[PDB]
Amino acid sequence: MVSVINTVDTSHEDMIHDAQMDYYGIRLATCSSDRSVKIFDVKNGGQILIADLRGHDGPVWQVAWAHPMYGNILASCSYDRKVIIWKEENGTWEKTYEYTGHDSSVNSVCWAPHDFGLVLACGSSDGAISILTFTGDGPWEVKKISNAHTIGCNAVSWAPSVIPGSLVDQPSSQKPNYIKRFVSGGCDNLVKIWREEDGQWKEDQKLEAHSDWVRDVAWAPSIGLPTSTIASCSQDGRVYIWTSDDAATNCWTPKLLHKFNDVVWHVSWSITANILAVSGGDNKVTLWKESVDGQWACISDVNKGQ
Amino acid sequence: FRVGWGPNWTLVHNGDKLKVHMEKLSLEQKSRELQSYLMPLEIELKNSSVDRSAQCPHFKPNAGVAAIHDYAGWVRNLSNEAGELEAVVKQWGLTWTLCESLWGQLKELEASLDEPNEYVRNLERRKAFSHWLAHTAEERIEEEVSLYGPERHVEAVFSFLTGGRISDACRLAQKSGDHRLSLLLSQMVGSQEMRELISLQLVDWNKLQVDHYIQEERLRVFCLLSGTPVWRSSDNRSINVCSQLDWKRTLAVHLWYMLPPTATIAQALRLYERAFQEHEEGEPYACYPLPPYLEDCSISLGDEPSAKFSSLQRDVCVHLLKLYSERQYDLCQLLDPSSVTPDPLDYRLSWHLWMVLQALNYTHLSEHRQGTLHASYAAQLENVGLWEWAIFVLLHIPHPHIREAGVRELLNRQCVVRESPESLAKENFLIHRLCVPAQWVHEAKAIRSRRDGDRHKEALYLLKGHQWNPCHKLVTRHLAADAVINENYRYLQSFLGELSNPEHCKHIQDWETAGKVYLDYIRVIDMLNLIQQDESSGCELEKLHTKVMSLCKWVELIHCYTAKDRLAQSEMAKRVANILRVVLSLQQPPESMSDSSEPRVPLRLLAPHIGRLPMPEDYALEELRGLTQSYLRELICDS
């Protein structure tokens, strides 16, 4: 039984596009068409607005929390073509960086695993993906993947730092081989996997099963599984689960999870990679879980009552 | 924004409520449920071994059947100690007592000094399983017999026969005045000839069309005693013996009446499976083995049954009976929560069954499904607030890197920086019982202290966590300047003193240019305070002089990032120059007492070091004015 634990009045003046909890589940960031990002302390069924972040000139599409080892850092991306990096210092939030290297709307932002440092992926309607890296010394470094998707990139999601199975087959003295990978979805109906090799980003895999724009992509957290899992959703109303049992074979198998009667906007994994949330154009959020036979079942249809 | 699960089953999504939505999925928590989690986990912790060969501890279940008896003993004690057991714990009782009947130690097999022949093992297992079936039907038979009263004594006799209680069926028949039925029932123990005679009697009643004058309930008793599951009366009425029976009593009737006393559990199961499958030779006469939360669901089997049974989950007990009969039976269906509970997120029984099946040497569960069981049950324990036991569940993951990642991830979420007696009890459980490295607990507390902005506690936990490089960078950049400005040298010495160990210093980047300079500065202050309190020997004054002269060179090389660091560097420079003057004044022999001149500080030794110290312009000008006035006084006294 899923129960509503808390209801947050965000006091946004226009449509909310994203809502992200911090790593500890004690802060909520929200972003809106009102061009603001709001941050709430969420404790014991209360909320307190702690920041109203202003710096975008258009609708803010996505927010993403960095890993807490780097402090309280938030990325935001917007229709205004900006990516903004916000940081809290001494209880005050400030704009620490602004990236304007995209020619169109920046639709998605995702932080890399903390093993890689402060690295942010940014997907844009200019069809490019930018990778922003902060080394601690000097300006943010930028690697731009031009023509990542035709027409536009809608979503980006980082792979886990450690390959599935690499902790089971290691005799006691080799460091885990950390491979920088992320997945993207675009307006060319493709899901694409990117890999860093020799300091360059290459298209590692091209995943073909959607018949219209890929709206969102989510790489599942690898908690002790030997398999890599990706979810994708599309304007075609389909949700696919992509699985790869061997990181060497580069073989990805699509499984249709469901076909909705309307557009599917978002897919999000639980931190334990055992539940997938799916958000449709029908104003519903559905929760999906894999059964022991590998079958996906809907375990909650949260009707927005009121 | 990324859709995903946060801690304590917090779903963050952009879809309709089941704009960013944050929804907390709570299993309904009654406060009596915590003991239902802890006791099974303590049984598994007693019945597991810790491999310490790797940096991440690995728990494995101990090979054998001891865990099965500890679980079966636990559920028996719970059934004896209180009214209103959770219906779920009654179902676990059936499951664990079945596991004990199938795989557990039998006292009858231990009483023989010789290795018991496979036939004797199969016979004693069949008896143990027969006793299990009889006990599972006891509550329901007593309810049924209480309902039938004295007028429906034949239905109450039938109910006792379907529980294997032939003696009580005989006594009831005798008390009701049915002496013919009582005599018949007294002869049923061990005679196959009697079964064949009753079968002939049924055939003769049907041929003579006398069966239509006999009560249906009475014919049903004769059908059961003959070992015929379905009888067609001369009136074309079908008498089904299994029509009013649950799947457990139906399987028991197949074991006791339909099969010979030498028949195996696997033969009884296969005969029962054919009884509810559609075959060319007859209509299904047995119920399908549904889980107990579906047994009362009137699933109207409307006119197409073959496509619906492939979608209907079986009771976990039937999956265990299949696994016992067929060693390669699919564990994925057996360990699915839907075989036990209406809640698909309840991995309690499934996870403990997997540990026991692994102890029995079942290994054919895929690594992906093992990972799902460990992750799902650990997430359930995290949501209930038993996250220390969620670590224990994750320590069973075979793969070392996945295990280590999952344990550190859970520590980073749930480790509290505030020392409560409960938090310290959980930490002691992890370090002393689970053998988790204390370093990882301190690393998680350091990361949490960083989030909370507590730089002191961050430095303390990085030190305890053996993270020397991060600790040194934090102390030098953020604690050293504030400690120097506030004259809190003992506080800076506690961190820099521990970092100064010769085994730790080799691993520290830039130790000599930053961390050592602050430590050597504190040591120079401490030695000066000692020299002011004891009338000190000239050897300690020469050691102080050599250290002060070295510090004058190294204070310049301190990297200043903040205005506070420059202030601390300037205060250190001012203090070190004053110390150098005092030391040079005290190194003089007392043989130049001409009354009326201040102590003659030798300017040639002082001037090269004052000009290299990063002093504020105003103080550097005062020092240069003092040096020029004293140099003018040296020139006026040498003329």
Short mmCIF file of N, CA and C in Angstrom, two decimals, chain B residues 188-321:
data_model
loop_
_atom_site.label_atom_id
_atom_site.label_comp_id
_atom_site.label_asym_id
_atom_site.label_seq_id
_atom_site.Cartn_x
_atom_site.Cartn_y
_atom_site.Cartn_z
N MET B 188 -9.82 -50.50 8.46
CA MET B 188 -9.14 -49.76 7.38
C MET B 188 -7.63 -49.61 7.59
N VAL B 189 -7.14 -49.76 8.83
CA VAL B 189 -5.71 -49.59 9.13
C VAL B 189 -4.93 -50.80 8.62
N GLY B 190 -4.34 -50.67 7.42
CA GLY B 190 -3.33 -51.60 6.90
C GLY B 190 -3.83 -52.74 6.01
N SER B 191 -5.13 -52.84 5.70
CA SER B 191 -5.66 -53.88 4.81
C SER B 191 -6.03 -53.33 3.42
N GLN B 192 -5.26 -53.71 2.40
CA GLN B 192 -5.60 -53.43 0.99
C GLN B 192 -6.82 -54.24 0.53
N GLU B 193 -6.98 -55.47 1.04
CA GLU B 193 -8.11 -56.34 0.73
C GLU B 193 -9.44 -55.67 1.09
N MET B 194 -9.49 -54.96 2.23
CA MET B 194 -10.69 -54.25 2.65
C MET B 194 -11.08 -53.14 1.67
N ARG B 195 -10.10 -52.41 1.14
CA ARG B 195 -10.31 -51.37 0.13
C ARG B 195 -10.91 -51.96 -1.15
N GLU B 196 -10.40 -53.10 -1.59
CA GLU B 196 -10.89 -53.82 -2.78
C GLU B 196 -12.32 -54.33 -2.58
N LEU B 197 -12.64 -54.85 -1.39
CA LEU B 197 -14.01 -55.26 -1.05
C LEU B 197 -15.00 -54.09 -1.07
N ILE B 198 -14.61 -52.92 -0.55
CA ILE B 198 -15.46 -51.72 -0.61
C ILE B 198 -15.63 -51.26 -2.07
N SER B 199 -14.58 -51.33 -2.88
CA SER B 199 -14.66 -51.01 -4.31
C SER B 199 -15.64 -51.93 -5.04
N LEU B 200 -15.58 -53.24 -4.79
CA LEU B 200 -16.55 -54.21 -5.33
C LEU B 200 -17.98 -53.89 -4.87
N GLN B 201 -18.16 -53.55 -3.59
CA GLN B 201 -19.46 -53.18 -3.04
C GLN B 201 -20.06 -51.95 -3.74
N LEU B 202 -19.25 -50.92 -4.02
CA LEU B 202 -19.68 -49.74 -4.76
C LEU B 202 -20.11 -50.10 -6.19
N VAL B 203 -19.32 -50.92 -6.88
CA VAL B 203 -19.63 -51.40 -8.24
C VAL B 203 -20.95 -52.18 -8.25
N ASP B 204 -21.18 -53.04 -7.26
CA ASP B 204 -22.41 -53.83 -7.18
C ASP B 204 -23.63 -52.96 -6.88
N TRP B 205 -23.51 -51.97 -5.98
CA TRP B 205 -24.59 -51.00 -5.75
C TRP B 205 -24.94 -50.20 -7.00
N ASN B 206 -23.94 -49.82 -7.80
CA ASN B 206 -24.17 -49.11 -9.05
C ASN B 206 -24.84 -49.99 -10.12
N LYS B 207 -24.37 -51.24 -10.30
CA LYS B 207 -24.98 -52.21 -11.23
C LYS B 207 -26.43 -52.54 -10.88
N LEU B 208 -26.72 -52.65 -9.59
CA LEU B 208 -28.06 -52.95 -9.08
C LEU B 208 -28.94 -51.70 -8.93
N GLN B 209 -28.42 -50.51 -9.25
CA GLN B 209 -29.10 -49.22 -9.08
C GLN B 209 -29.61 -49.00 -7.65
N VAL B 210 -28.86 -49.46 -6.64
CA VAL B 210 -29.20 -49.27 -5.22
C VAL B 210 -28.53 -48.01 -4.66
N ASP B 211 -27.46 -47.55 -5.30
CA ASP B 211 -26.70 -46.35 -4.92
C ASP B 211 -27.56 -45.09 -4.86
N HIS B 212 -28.58 -44.95 -5.71
CA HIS B 212 -29.46 -43.77 -5.68
C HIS B 212 -30.32 -43.63 -4.41
N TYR B 213 -30.51 -44.71 -3.65
CA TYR B 213 -31.23 -44.68 -2.37
C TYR B 213 -30.31 -44.37 -1.18
N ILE B 214 -28.99 -44.33 -1.39
CA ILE B 214 -28.00 -44.08 -0.35
C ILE B 214 -27.73 -42.57 -0.28
N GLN B 215 -27.64 -42.03 0.93
CA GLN B 215 -27.23 -40.64 1.18
C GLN B 215 -25.88 -40.33 0.51
N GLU B 216 -25.76 -39.16 -0.11
CA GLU B 216 -24.57 -38.77 -0.86
C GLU B 216 -23.33 -38.70 0.04
N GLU B 217 -23.49 -38.17 1.25
CA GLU B 217 -22.42 -38.04 2.25
C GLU B 217 -21.88 -39.41 2.65
N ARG B 218 -22.77 -40.41 2.73
CA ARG B 218 -22.41 -41.79 3.05
C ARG B 218 -21.69 -42.45 1.89
N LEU B 219 -22.18 -42.29 0.66
CA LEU B 219 -21.48 -42.76 -0.53
C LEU B 219 -20.10 -42.12 -0.65
N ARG B 220 -19.96 -40.83 -0.32
CA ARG B 220 -18.68 -40.12 -0.31
C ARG B 220 -17.68 -40.74 0.66
N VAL B 221 -18.12 -41.15 1.85
CA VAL B 221 -17.29 -41.92 2.79
C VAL B 221 -16.85 -43.25 2.17
N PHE B 222 -17.76 -44.02 1.56
CA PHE B 222 -17.38 -45.28 0.90
C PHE B 222 -16.41 -45.07 -0.27
N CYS B 223 -16.60 -44.02 -1.08
CA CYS B 223 -15.70 -43.65 -2.17
C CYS B 223 -14.29 -43.35 -1.65
N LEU B 224 -14.18 -42.55 -0.58
CA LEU B 224 -12.91 -42.26 0.09
C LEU B 224 -12.23 -43.55 0.58
N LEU B 225 -12.97 -44.43 1.25
CA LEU B 225 -12.41 -45.68 1.79
C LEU B 225 -11.98 -46.66 0.69
N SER B 226 -12.66 -46.67 -0.45
CA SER B 226 -12.29 -47.48 -1.62
C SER B 226 -11.08 -46.95 -2.39
N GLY B 227 -10.65 -45.71 -2.13
CA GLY B 227 -9.59 -45.07 -2.90
C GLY B 227 -10.03 -44.63 -4.30
N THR B 228 -11.32 -44.34 -4.50
CA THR B 228 -11.84 -43.75 -5.75
C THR B 228 -12.16 -42.26 -5.53
N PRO B 229 -11.49 -41.32 -6.22
CA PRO B 229 -11.67 -39.89 -5.99
C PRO B 229 -13.01 -39.34 -6.50
N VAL B 230 -13.48 -39.85 -7.65
CA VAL B 230 -14.75 -39.48 -8.26
C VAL B 230 -15.55 -40.75 -8.54
N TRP B 231 -16.80 -40.77 -8.10
CA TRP B 231 -17.72 -41.87 -8.35
C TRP B 231 -18.95 -41.38 -9.13
N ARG B 232 -19.32 -42.10 -10.19
CA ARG B 232 -20.56 -41.82 -10.94
C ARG B 232 -21.65 -42.78 -10.48
N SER B 233 -22.66 -42.23 -9.81
CA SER B 233 -23.85 -42.97 -9.38
C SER B 233 -24.71 -43.37 -10.59
N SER B 234 -25.58 -44.36 -10.42
CA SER B 234 -26.49 -44.86 -11.47
C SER B 234 -27.47 -43.80 -11.97
N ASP B 235 -27.78 -42.81 -11.13
CA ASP B 235 -28.56 -41.60 -11.44
C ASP B 235 -27.79 -40.53 -12.23
N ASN B 236 -26.58 -40.85 -12.71
CA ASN B 236 -25.66 -39.92 -13.37
C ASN B 236 -25.19 -38.74 -12.49
N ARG B 237 -25.29 -38.88 -11.16
CA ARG B 237 -24.73 -37.93 -10.19
C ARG B 237 -23.25 -38.23 -9.96
N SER B 238 -22.40 -37.21 -10.07
CA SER B 238 -20.97 -37.31 -9.77
C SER B 238 -20.70 -36.98 -8.30
N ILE B 239 -20.20 -37.95 -7.55
CA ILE B 239 -19.79 -37.79 -6.15
C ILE B 239 -18.28 -37.54 -6.15
N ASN B 240 -17.89 -36.30 -5.88
CA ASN B 240 -16.49 -35.89 -5.79
C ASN B 240 -16.05 -35.78 -4.32
N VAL B 241 -15.12 -36.65 -3.92
CA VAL B 241 -14.56 -36.68 -2.56
C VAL B 241 -13.80 -35.39 -2.22
N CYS B 242 -13.18 -34.75 -3.20
CA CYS B 242 -12.31 -33.58 -3.00
C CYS B 242 -13.05 -32.23 -3.11
N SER B 243 -14.34 -32.23 -3.45
CA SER B 243 -15.11 -31.00 -3.75
C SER B 243 -15.20 -29.98 -2.60
N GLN B 244 -15.15 -30.44 -1.35
CA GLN B 244 -15.26 -29.59 -0.15
C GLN B 244 -13.94 -29.46 0.60
N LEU B 245 -12.84 -29.94 0.02
CA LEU B 245 -11.54 -29.98 0.67
C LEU B 245 -10.64 -28.86 0.15
N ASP B 246 -9.87 -28.27 1.04
CA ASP B 246 -8.74 -27.42 0.67
C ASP B 246 -7.65 -28.27 0.00
N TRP B 247 -6.68 -27.61 -0.63
CA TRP B 247 -5.67 -28.31 -1.41
C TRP B 247 -4.79 -29.21 -0.53
N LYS B 248 -4.57 -28.82 0.74
CA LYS B 248 -3.77 -29.57 1.72
C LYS B 248 -4.47 -30.88 2.10
N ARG B 249 -5.76 -30.84 2.47
CA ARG B 249 -6.55 -32.07 2.73
C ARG B 249 -6.73 -32.90 1.47
N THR B 250 -6.90 -32.27 0.31
CA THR B 250 -6.97 -32.98 -0.97
C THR B 250 -5.69 -33.77 -1.22
N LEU B 251 -4.52 -33.15 -1.06
CA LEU B 251 -3.23 -33.83 -1.17
C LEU B 251 -3.07 -34.95 -0.13
N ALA B 252 -3.55 -34.73 1.10
CA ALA B 252 -3.53 -35.74 2.16
C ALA B 252 -4.37 -36.97 1.82
N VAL B 253 -5.57 -36.78 1.26
CA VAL B 253 -6.43 -37.87 0.79
C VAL B 253 -5.74 -38.69 -0.29
N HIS B 254 -5.03 -38.04 -1.23
CA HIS B 254 -4.23 -38.74 -2.24
C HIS B 254 -3.11 -39.58 -1.61
N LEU B 255 -2.43 -39.06 -0.58
CA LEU B 255 -1.34 -39.74 0.12
C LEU B 255 -1.82 -40.94 0.97
N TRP B 256 -2.98 -40.83 1.62
CA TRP B 256 -3.48 -41.81 2.58
C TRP B 256 -4.37 -42.89 1.96
N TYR B 257 -5.26 -42.51 1.04
CA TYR B 257 -6.32 -43.39 0.53
C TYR B 257 -6.12 -43.79 -0.93
N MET B 258 -5.63 -42.89 -1.79
CA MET B 258 -5.53 -43.14 -3.23
C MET B 258 -4.25 -43.88 -3.63
N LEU B 259 -3.20 -43.78 -2.82
CA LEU B 259 -1.90 -44.40 -3.07
C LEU B 259 -1.59 -45.52 -2.06
N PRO B 260 -0.70 -46.47 -2.41
CA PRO B 260 -0.23 -47.49 -1.48
C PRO B 260 0.65 -46.88 -0.37
N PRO B 261 0.79 -47.55 0.79
CA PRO B 261 1.60 -47.06 1.91
C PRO B 261 3.11 -46.98 1.61
N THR B 262 3.55 -47.53 0.49
CA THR B 262 4.94 -47.46 0.01
C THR B 262 5.18 -46.29 -0.95
N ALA B 263 4.13 -45.55 -1.34
CA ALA B 263 4.23 -44.48 -2.32
C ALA B 263 5.01 -43.27 -1.78
N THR B 264 5.83 -42.65 -2.63
CA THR B 264 6.64 -41.49 -2.26
C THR B 264 5.83 -40.19 -2.27
N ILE B 265 6.35 -39.16 -1.59
CA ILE B 265 5.75 -37.80 -1.59
C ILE B 265 5.62 -37.28 -3.03
N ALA B 266 6.62 -37.52 -3.87
CA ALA B 266 6.60 -37.13 -5.28
C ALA B 266 5.48 -37.81 -6.09
N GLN B 267 5.15 -39.08 -5.78
CA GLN B 267 4.02 -39.77 -6.42
C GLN B 267 2.68 -39.17 -6.00
N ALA B 268 2.52 -38.83 -4.72
CA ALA B 268 1.32 -38.15 -4.21
C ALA B 268 1.12 -36.78 -4.85
N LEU B 269 2.19 -35.99 -4.96
CA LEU B 269 2.15 -34.68 -5.60
C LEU B 269 1.75 -34.79 -7.08
N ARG B 270 2.38 -35.70 -7.85
CA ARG B 270 2.02 -35.90 -9.26
C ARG B 270 0.57 -36.35 -9.46
N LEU B 271 0.04 -37.18 -8.57
CA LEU B 271 -1.35 -37.62 -8.66
C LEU B 271 -2.31 -36.45 -8.37
N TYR B 272 -2.00 -35.64 -7.37
CA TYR B 272 -2.74 -34.41 -7.07
C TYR B 272 -2.67 -33.39 -8.22
N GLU B 273 -1.52 -33.23 -8.87
CA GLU B 273 -1.39 -32.33 -10.02
C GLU B 273 -2.26 -32.71 -11.21
N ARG B 274 -2.37 -34.01 -11.48
CA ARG B 274 -3.28 -34.53 -12.50
C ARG B 274 -4.75 -34.34 -12.13
N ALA B 275 -5.06 -34.22 -10.84
CA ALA B 275 -6.43 -34.12 -10.35
C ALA B 275 -7.09 -32.75 -10.62
N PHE B 276 -6.29 -31.69 -10.75
CA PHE B 276 -6.79 -30.34 -11.07
C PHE B 276 -6.44 -29.88 -12.49
N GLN B 277 -5.65 -30.66 -13.24
CA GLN B 277 -5.39 -30.41 -14.66
C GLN B 277 -6.51 -31.00 -15.52
N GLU B 278 -6.89 -30.29 -16.58
CA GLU B 278 -7.82 -30.83 -17.57
C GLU B 278 -7.13 -31.93 -18.39
N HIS B 279 -7.74 -33.11 -18.43
CA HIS B 279 -7.27 -34.24 -19.22
C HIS B 279 -8.41 -34.81 -20.07
N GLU B 280 -8.07 -35.51 -21.16
CA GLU B 280 -9.04 -36.13 -22.08
C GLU B 280 -9.94 -37.19 -21.39
N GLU B 281 -9.52 -37.69 -20.22
CA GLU B 281 -10.16 -38.80 -19.50
C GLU B 281 -11.13 -38.37 -18.37
N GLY B 282 -11.26 -37.07 -18.07
CA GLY B 282 -12.20 -36.60 -17.04
C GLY B 282 -12.09 -35.12 -16.66
N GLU B 283 -13.15 -34.61 -16.05
CA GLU B 283 -13.21 -33.25 -15.49
C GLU B 283 -12.30 -33.12 -14.25
N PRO B 284 -11.66 -31.95 -14.04
CA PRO B 284 -10.85 -31.70 -12.86
C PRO B 284 -11.72 -31.82 -11.60
N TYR B 285 -11.23 -32.58 -10.61
CA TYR B 285 -11.97 -32.87 -9.39
C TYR B 285 -11.31 -32.30 -8.13
N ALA B 286 -10.07 -31.83 -8.22
CA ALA B 286 -9.35 -31.21 -7.12
C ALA B 286 -9.26 -29.69 -7.28
N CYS B 287 -9.15 -28.98 -6.15
CA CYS B 287 -8.87 -27.55 -6.14
C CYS B 287 -7.40 -27.26 -6.52
N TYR B 288 -7.16 -26.13 -7.18
CA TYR B 288 -5.82 -25.64 -7.50
C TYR B 288 -5.13 -25.11 -6.23
N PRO B 289 -3.81 -25.34 -6.03
CA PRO B 289 -3.13 -24.99 -4.79
C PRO B 289 -2.80 -23.49 -4.74
N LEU B 290 -3.80 -22.69 -4.36
CA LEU B 290 -3.67 -21.25 -4.17
C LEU B 290 -3.01 -20.92 -2.82
N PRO B 291 -2.24 -19.81 -2.73
CA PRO B 291 -1.79 -19.25 -1.46
C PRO B 291 -2.97 -18.93 -0.53
N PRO B 292 -2.79 -18.93 0.80
CA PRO B 292 -3.92 -18.86 1.73
C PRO B 292 -4.69 -17.54 1.67
N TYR B 293 -4.05 -16.44 1.26
CA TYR B 293 -4.73 -15.16 1.06
C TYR B 293 -5.61 -15.12 -0.20
N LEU B 294 -5.48 -16.11 -1.09
CA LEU B 294 -6.31 -16.31 -2.28
C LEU B 294 -7.27 -17.50 -2.15
N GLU B 295 -7.12 -18.36 -1.12
CA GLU B 295 -7.96 -19.56 -0.93
C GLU B 295 -9.46 -19.20 -0.79
N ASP B 296 -9.79 -18.07 -0.14
CA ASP B 296 -11.17 -17.59 0.04
C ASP B 296 -11.64 -16.64 -1.07
N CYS B 297 -10.74 -16.24 -1.98
CA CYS B 297 -11.14 -15.51 -3.17
C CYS B 297 -11.89 -16.49 -4.07
N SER B 298 -13.21 -16.34 -4.15
CA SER B 298 -14.06 -17.04 -5.11
C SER B 298 -13.70 -16.61 -6.54
N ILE B 299 -12.54 -17.04 -7.02
CA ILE B 299 -12.16 -16.94 -8.42
C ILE B 299 -13.10 -17.91 -9.12
N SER B 300 -14.21 -17.38 -9.63
CA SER B 300 -15.10 -18.11 -10.50
C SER B 300 -14.29 -18.52 -11.73
N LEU B 301 -13.90 -19.79 -11.75
CA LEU B 301 -13.32 -20.46 -12.90
C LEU B 301 -14.41 -20.55 -13.98
N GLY B 302 -14.73 -19.43 -14.63
CA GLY B 302 -15.55 -19.43 -15.84
C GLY B 302 -14.84 -20.18 -16.97
N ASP B 303 -15.64 -20.68 -17.91
CA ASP B 303 -15.48 -21.66 -19.01
C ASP B 303 -14.13 -21.84 -19.76
N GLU B 304 -13.05 -21.13 -19.43
CA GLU B 304 -11.71 -21.29 -20.02
C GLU B 304 -10.63 -21.34 -18.90
N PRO B 305 -10.37 -22.53 -18.32
CA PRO B 305 -9.50 -22.68 -17.15
C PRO B 305 -8.00 -22.83 -17.50
N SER B 306 -7.65 -23.38 -18.66
CA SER B 306 -6.25 -23.70 -19.03
C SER B 306 -5.32 -22.48 -19.16
N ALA B 307 -5.82 -21.35 -19.70
CA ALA B 307 -5.05 -20.11 -19.84
C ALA B 307 -4.93 -19.30 -18.53
N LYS B 308 -5.82 -19.54 -17.55
CA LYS B 308 -5.85 -18.81 -16.27
C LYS B 308 -4.91 -19.44 -15.23
N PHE B 309 -4.76 -20.77 -15.21
CA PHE B 309 -3.84 -21.44 -14.27
C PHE B 309 -2.37 -21.07 -14.48
N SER B 310 -1.94 -20.76 -15.71
CA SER B 310 -0.58 -20.27 -15.96
C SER B 310 -0.29 -18.89 -15.35
N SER B 311 -1.33 -18.12 -15.02
CA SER B 311 -1.22 -16.80 -14.39
C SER B 311 -1.42 -16.83 -12.87
N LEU B 312 -1.96 -17.92 -12.33
CA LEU B 312 -2.26 -18.06 -10.91
C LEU B 312 -1.05 -18.60 -10.15
N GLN B 313 -0.58 -17.81 -9.20
CA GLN B 313 0.52 -18.17 -8.33
C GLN B 313 0.13 -19.36 -7.44
N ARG B 314 1.08 -20.28 -7.20
CA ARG B 314 0.89 -21.43 -6.32
C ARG B 314 1.36 -21.11 -4.91
N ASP B 315 0.80 -21.81 -3.93
CA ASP B 315 1.28 -21.77 -2.55
C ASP B 315 2.77 -22.19 -2.48
N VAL B 316 3.56 -21.46 -1.68
CA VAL B 316 4.98 -21.73 -1.42
C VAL B 316 5.24 -23.18 -0.98
N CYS B 317 4.31 -23.79 -0.23
CA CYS B 317 4.41 -25.17 0.23
C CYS B 317 4.41 -26.16 -0.94
N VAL B 318 3.61 -25.92 -1.98
CA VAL B 318 3.62 -26.74 -3.20
C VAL B 318 4.92 -26.55 -3.96
N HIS B 319 5.45 -25.33 -4.03
CA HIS B 319 6.76 -25.09 -4.63
C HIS B 319 7.88 -25.84 -3.89
N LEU B 320 7.86 -25.87 -2.56
CA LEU B 320 8.82 -26.65 -1.76
C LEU B 320 8.67 -28.16 -1.97
N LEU B 321 7.44 -28.67 -2.06
CA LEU B 321 7.19 -30.09 -2.38
C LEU B 321 7.69 -30.47 -3.78
#
